[PDB]
Amino acid sequence: CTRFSDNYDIKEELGKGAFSIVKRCVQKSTGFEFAAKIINTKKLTARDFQKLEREARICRKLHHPNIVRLHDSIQEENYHYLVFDLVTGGELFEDIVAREFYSEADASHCIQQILESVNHCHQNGVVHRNLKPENLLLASKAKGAAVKLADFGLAIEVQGDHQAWFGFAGTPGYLSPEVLKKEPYGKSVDIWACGVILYILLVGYPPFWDEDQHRLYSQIKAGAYDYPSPEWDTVTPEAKNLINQMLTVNPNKRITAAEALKHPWI
Amino acid sequence: ATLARQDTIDEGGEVD
Numbered sequence: 244c245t246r247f248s249d250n251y252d253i254k255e256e257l258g259k260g261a262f263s264i265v266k267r268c269v270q271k272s273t274g275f276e277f278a279a280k281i282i283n284t285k286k287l288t289a290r291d292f293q294k295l296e297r298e299a300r301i302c303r304k305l306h307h308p309n310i311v312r313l314h315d316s317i318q319e320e321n322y323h324y325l326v327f328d329l330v331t332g333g334e335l336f337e338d339i340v341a342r343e344f345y346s347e348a349d350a351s352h353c354i355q356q357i358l359e360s361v362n363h364c365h366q367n368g369v370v371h372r373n374l375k376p377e378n379l380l381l382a383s384k385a386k387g388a389a390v391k392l393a394d395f396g397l398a399i400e401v402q403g404d405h406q407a408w409f410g411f412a413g414t415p416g417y418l419s420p421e422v423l424k425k426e427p428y429g430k431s432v433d434i435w436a437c438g439v440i441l442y443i444l445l446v447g448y449p450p451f452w453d454e455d456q457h458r459l460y461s462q463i464k465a466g467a468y469d470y471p472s473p474e475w476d477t478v479t480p481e482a483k484n485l486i487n488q489m490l491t492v493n494p495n496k497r498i499t500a501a502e503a504l505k506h507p508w509i
Numbered sequence: 510a511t512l513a514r515q516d517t518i519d520e521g522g523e524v525d
């Protein structure tokens with residue numbers, strides 16, 4: 244193919260993760276703008292290409308207002324393009340650092356939307372495996388803007404409650420104890436990450452952190468975290484309750500997305 | 510401790 248290069252004009256960088264760069268682009272025939280996730284494929288292995296197909300496949304399957312929409316998937320000689328609807332408000336990540344933290348009200352609304360996107364994945368038999376603020380995009384800069392779940396690069400399929408060893412993958416500070424313990428795991432790992440995100444929403448820094456990554460993983464596995472003063476003094480216990488239920492070490496004892504959305508604090 | 514971006518990892522190892 245030259246199907247992308249022929250039909251799209253690439254514009255500015257929007258963002259990047261570990262192995263892609265996302266640029267705004269414009270479709271020539273329409274003048275409509277999109278986000279083109281670009282992956283250099285020269286270096287890539289058979290497994291890496293199957294992962295791209297998997298990404299495109301699962302994104303299409305999960306089409307929904309709170310999930311990024313895939314417009315096309317195109318392989319040229321040296322690059323693959325996943326063309327998505329453009330989400331213009333930037334990463335939740337940015338907005339959090341811009342504000343330091345969200346009020347309980349706004350955190351509550353934001354995590355509600357995140358959990359709605361996650362539950363949408365789970366009730367369609369998908370575990371995302373890489374929930375974090377970099378992978379949640381905002382429809383705009385306005386308060387309570389819609390939240391869009393992105394980056395299905397690691398997403399895989401699972402039946403219901405089932406758990407199996409789906410491999411060592413995710414983003415370190417968001418990884419679940421069970422992934423770190425190399426135990427079989429399932430949808431419930433995304434809920435752990437939502438716990439980490441909600442904690443970040445409330446004080447603007449993560450509950451597990453260490454410069455030594457070996458130590459970070461220790462902390463996660465042990466579920467060692469607390470609510471330090473003065474940051475957390477004004478935060479309601481009910482908010483802290485919801486975090487505790489998500490940051491429950493044993494995944495069998497962990498709150499699901501469905502019953503997270505029913506928490507009084509939500 | 511602060512909020513900083515973090516790269517994705519995938520070491521596979523998935524087992525049939």
Ligand SMILES: Nc1ncnc2c1ncn2[C@@H]1O[C@H](COP(=O)(O)OP(=O)(O)O)[C@@H](O)[C@H]1O
Pocket residue numbers: 257258259260261262263264265278280311327328329330331333334377378380393394395396517
């Ligand atoms: N649809 C989009 N609209 C706007 N920015 C996007 C969109 N999709 C991704 N991005 C930006 O690109 C970054 C990487 O997207 P991702 O799908 O996460 O690639 P990676 O696998 O490299 O993390 C995101 O963190 C975000 O900043």
Ligand SMILES: [Mg+2]
Pocket residue numbers: 259260261377378394
């Ligand atoms: Mg990403």
